[model samples]
Target: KSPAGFAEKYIIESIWNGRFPPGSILPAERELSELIGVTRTTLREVLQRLARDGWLTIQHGKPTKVNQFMETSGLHILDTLMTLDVDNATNIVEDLLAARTNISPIFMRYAFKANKENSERTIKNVIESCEALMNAASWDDFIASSPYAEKVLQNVKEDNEKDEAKRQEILIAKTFNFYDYMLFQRLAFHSGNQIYGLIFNGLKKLYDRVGSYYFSNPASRELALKFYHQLLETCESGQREQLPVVIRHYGMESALIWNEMKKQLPT
Candidate 1:
């Protein structure tokens, strides 16, 4: 019913932005469909996507309410981005890592239950993304060519292409800067715990300013990748549930790392 990830992203944004006030009745599907200019069927599909992401409480008969946005909730906010985010791998990785900080406990909490698939995917995604980061060219190639990178592709003429490339460079640099925090944010939500709205909102603002995608400094890129390999190794050696604790442990470190980054960023 949902059009790809459309419903999921919109629903997450609405709830994340407080459109779905806690403990309040949600609007009927027909009402929301009209408001969003989509067919009822389409809207329902969207609703299902939201429900799948743990944003909406959809029952067979009852109207849904926005779920709480905390580590305890296994919020799907980060999932929508996976389908729509156009940022480069490095920045995406860094930002996600930072966001992980505030919610590591949730990851730890849910290690034994929900998020087993998500946790595995997270590790695999990081590994693949790191591979791309290692071989990335300049910032331009990093953001524009990365498998998951997001951007509007244009077949414009020469002068415009040059200008566009230049504009993207600056945009991408700011994007790379936030790499430290976004990860923490996503992991926090994944941990299925309730969290402060302001925290996530602030991160969103930072993301807007920072854009998405940037090339990492070569040495730093490789070093972090080595650490990732070590993470995989540690995962192999530990018990089945080690991922949750490991994710949470690193989540804290990423938060502090991102804090320093925020201070050094532009005003």
Candidate 2:
């Protein structure tokens, strides 16, 4: 890794691992540079990067202070924390999924109101793409080059071909979940709020990590498809008030699936 990158990760790991707890000041630049084996210029760059992400507060005449990142940081910190810390990954995933239930409906309502014609077209395109992906020959054929597929295949049991076959089925189900996310992503773009798309992009990484598990059960995919169909119908019928109701119902159902997926993860 580049010295700056290494120093940044090192400092973040230290902060999260409790070596430098929230609200505590970081070591002085000179000492921190020596400790991390990086030059002062590199160390300063890392500190500025961390501070930009809401990890630390840099004051000219005072020691740099570690902010309570969980509350103070933006989405960037959440992405880094989710990647570097597996112990807290499930909790972060749960929180993001829960927040989606509330956030999605607001965006859906805005998208529908902003331009009903364009919003409906975008949603319809998303639905069509989703159906095409679901109808593809096999999940492996679609995502064979994806890291997720390689990760799933790496765990295959040598003696149990049935287990391997089962994993393939799960991968297929995950493709459905991928489209589930696309539905919202397209809607966010249509909502005319750039922040909505940015937020969705930030959450996409974490969602892709665990989203496939939610659709491993075929029933969950069915529920999601039905929700998409109903959403289009509601939009076409010009019942703007009912848009939130449709989104909320699907959100609640998906949250239940997410809770089940959480249980399946190893503690």
Candidate 3:
């Protein structure tokens, strides 16, 4: 790693994501530079970047402190994840899923309420979409043909026997695509909730990276597929009231799938 990149990486891995979570004051710059094995100049570069991205609170005279990335962070974290996070997407992915627990239900309810009157018409589109998925030869193909699938699936290798890690990466990417197209585009946008749409913009990167875990897991994927058909039937019958409950379970159940994957992955 370059001097600047190393400094930034250490702060993110060791400070922001480590023991010095939000509101924690960092050690003096001199000590921090020594810890990171960087010159004062390089450390400054890193600190500047972190401050810019809402990871650190910098003061001219007082000590630097960690900022709450969760409450205040913007799309920069997403950009950072895209660049700096090639190693273990799962750790951060977990954070993303946890965040979705609350936010998804709010938007899902909005969608159900807003579209309940039009559900019979909307459900037909869903039915056609699911039919394409049922005929698909593999998950890769299914998502590829899925109306709600993101275009990212074009790059994922269809063969699972290849590198599992790489396949998982592809799964995460496709998962994000699914959410981008489904949750944000079809559901949130159609829900007539402008606030939810704006929130989706902030979550764009997280959805892309974190989504892979559930969709890639065999149990989670099967469970989700089953729910998809059931959800379509609910929509077909105009069971809008049932949707909010289903959405809550969908959020909760998907979060649990990661625990299973974390156990299975080589430690």
Question: Which number leads on TM-score?
Answer: 2
Candidate 3: tens digits of C-alpha lDDT, residues 1-267: 367765676677665457667768988889998987889988887788788666788877988998765536656445455543423234455565556555665665666667765533444554455345445565567665665565534533346648766764555446434533463345556567777667666665555444453455546546665665656566556566777677668766766766656564431
Taken over the whole model, the C-alpha lDDT of each candidate is: 0.50, 0.70, 0.59
Who is ahead in lDDT, 1 or 3? Answer: 3
Question: Per-residue CA lDDT of candidate 1, range 196-249, in tens?
Answer: 323555456434433333232333334445545544555445454555556555
Q: How many times do residue backbones clash in model 1?
A: 35
Q: Candidates sorted by lDDT, descending order?
A: 2, 3, 1
How far off is residue 231 in model 1, in Å? 4.7
* Poorly placed runs, candidate 3 (over 4 Å): 1-24, 27-64, 67-99, 117-135, 138-184, 264-267
Model 1 scores a TM of 0.38
Show the lowest summed lDDT stretch of 10 residues, model 3: 82-91
Off by over 4 Å in 1: 1-105, 108-113, 151-182, 194-202, 207-267
TM-score result, candidate 2? 0.61
List clashing residue pairs in candidate 2. Answer: none
lDDT accuracy of residue 57 in candidate 2: 87
Instruction: Report the Cα lDDT for residue 194, model 3.
Output: 76
Q: Which ten residues in a row have the lowest lDDT in candidate 2?
A: 152-161
- Which portions of model 2 show Cα errors greater than 4 Å? 1-21, 24-79, 82-87, 135-137, 140-167
